[PDB]
Design a protein around this ligand. Structure first.
Ligand SMILES: *[C@@H]1O[C@H](CO)[C@@H](O[C@@H]2O[C@H](CO)[C@@H](O[C@@H]3O[C@H](CO[C@H]4O[C@H](CO)[C@@H](O)[C@H](O)[C@@H]4O)[C@@H](O)[C@H](O[C@H]4O[C@H](CO)[C@@H](O)[C@H](O)[C@@H]4O)[C@@H]3O)[C@H](O)[C@H]2NC(C)=O)[C@H](O)[C@H]1NC(C)=O
Ligand SMILES: *[C@@H]1O[C@H](CO)[C@@H](O[C@@H]2O[C@H](CO)[C@@H](O[C@@H]3O[C@H](CO[C@H]4O[C@H](CO)[C@@H](O)[C@H](O)[C@@H]4O)[C@@H](O)[C@H](O[C@H]4O[C@H](CO)[C@@H](O)[C@H](O)[C@@H]4O)[C@@H]3O)[C@H](O)[C@H]2NC(C)=O)[C@H](O)[C@H]1NC(C)=O
Lengths: 212, 213
């Protein structure tokens, strides 16, 4: 058992689309009822942080997981503010510190390719849609699926973690199982990516149907 | 902080079924270099003898010492459900570390393999990307390879995802293979092959694909 902490950047969707970005500090592998863990937010500039939301949940594995989500200013983030999570506990050797700021370096917009699986024996009342988004940088990307131009619940699909392409960019796969009911009432699906380098409006999408 | 952790892998279905020379690997991460040596000890639950293992040490560009032991195992022994344990002996560790591994057991289900070529995208048109979705297999142990002209490419040429749960009972995986004009022009024949215990016969399922059919 080893307590670790993870500090996330805002989702490009939250940041560019909803324009209400948040960051999250995730603390894993805590021993329940060993008193409470303090999660403290701060800014490198020293300016005030918003009220954060804290979530605790005991895990099937006897772990305690704690998260704090902090809303951040769109301007502040995009302008390069640095945000720190500090994790405290009297029962804990040192204190834990993660920090986060907008990514740097060169940008490159995503290529988005969407594919339908051919009918495979057995369940023919199901197909799988898949999406390859690649050659973007930096690695921060949001993926979503739409049916009939309306966004599906995020739980409907699986998206992979950004892996390095053989070059300088990253790629990602998204998988979306669909039903006959769905593609029959309209065979229109969109894999949409949100990425800082996509112009304009940080969005790139690709349509795909079960039939060609 | 810094957490020494240990990982014990099952044999690759390729090694196991195709090369019929399976191995397991114990990986120990986040060691403090020159804190003396870490012992990695192999054992079998049946108490029968273990082969000679290979040990690899490498300081990482992050200051971490990484240690691995690879143990060759009997095909029969594995498939018959022998259990193998890695024991990790070290000073900076209060409790010794123990991982164990055995063949998986539960519902079997063969993989569905679908292969796709990316359309020509502006910029580099001397490159395409092949992609493969393998899904609905169980258990999660799978090998993926790409062939061009019926000959297997170097594993480094492609990226394969980690098995994720499908919405159902099975797993899926994606493989990505960038190709060159030189390659698909001299023959536009590529195969995504999976090796999986549930695939019959001969534990193999593959699918062909080409740049602009
Ligand atoms: C008890 O059981 C729980 C699960 O039920 C385990 O909790 C998990 O713990 C692991 C590791 O300790 C966590 O892994 C880390 O997750 C981070 C975020 O998770 C996802 O969700 C966010 C959005 O909330 C996404 O941004 C992200 O893509 C993930 O989908 C990752 O960011 C971590 O980083 C990984 O990639 C980076 C590359 O930048 C590497 O640096 C890291 O090394 C790593 O590869 C990492 O994946 C996991 O999040 C926890 N699950 C939950 C609840 O989300 C406990 O670990 C378990 N305890 C024991 C003893 O087993
Ligand atoms: C300092 O730098 C080193 C060197 O890069 C980092 O070491 C890596 O650390 C991670 C996590 O500790 C190791 O992850 C483990 O890899 C195992 C083997 O992976 C290889 O083989 C598999 C086949 O199983 C391939 O699919 C894969 O692409 C690799 O080729 C996996 O078996 C493990 O998977 C299990 O645990 C992870 C936990 O993250 C889960 O997400 C999985 O679902 C699964 O349960 C595991 O991922 C990695 O191998 C190390 N690299 C090596 C080989 O040295 C240090 O992490 C880094 N320290 C810092 C600063 O973070």
């Amino acid at each position: 058992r080893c307590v670790s902490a993870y500090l996330s950047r805002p989702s490009p969707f939250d940041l560019f689309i909803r324009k209400s970005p948040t960051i999250t500090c995730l603390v894993v592998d805590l021993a329940p009822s060993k008193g409470t863990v303090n999660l403290t937010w701060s800014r490198a500039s020293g300016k005030p942080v918003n009220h954060s939301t804290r979530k605790e949940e005991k895990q099937r594995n006897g772990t305690l997981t704690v998260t704090s989500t902090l809303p951040v200013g769109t301007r502040d983030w995009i302008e390069g503010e640095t945000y720190q999570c500090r994790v405290t506990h009297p029962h804990l050797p040192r204190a834990l510190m993660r920090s986060t700021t907008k990514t740097s370096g060169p940008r490159a917009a995503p290529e988005v390719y969407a594919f339908a699986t051919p009918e495979w024996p057995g369940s023919r009342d199901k197909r799988t849609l898949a999406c390859l988004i690649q050659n973007f940088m930096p690695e921060d990307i949001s993926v979503q699926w739409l049916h009939n131009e309306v966004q599906l619940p995020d739980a409907r699909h699986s998206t992979t973690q950004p892996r390095k392409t053989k070059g300088s960019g990253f790629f990602v796969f998204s998988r979306l199982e669909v039903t006959r009911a769905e593609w029959e009432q309209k065979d229109e699906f969109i894999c949409r990516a949100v990425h800082e380098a996509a112009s304009p409006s940080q969005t790139v999408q690709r349509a795909v149907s079960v039939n060609p």
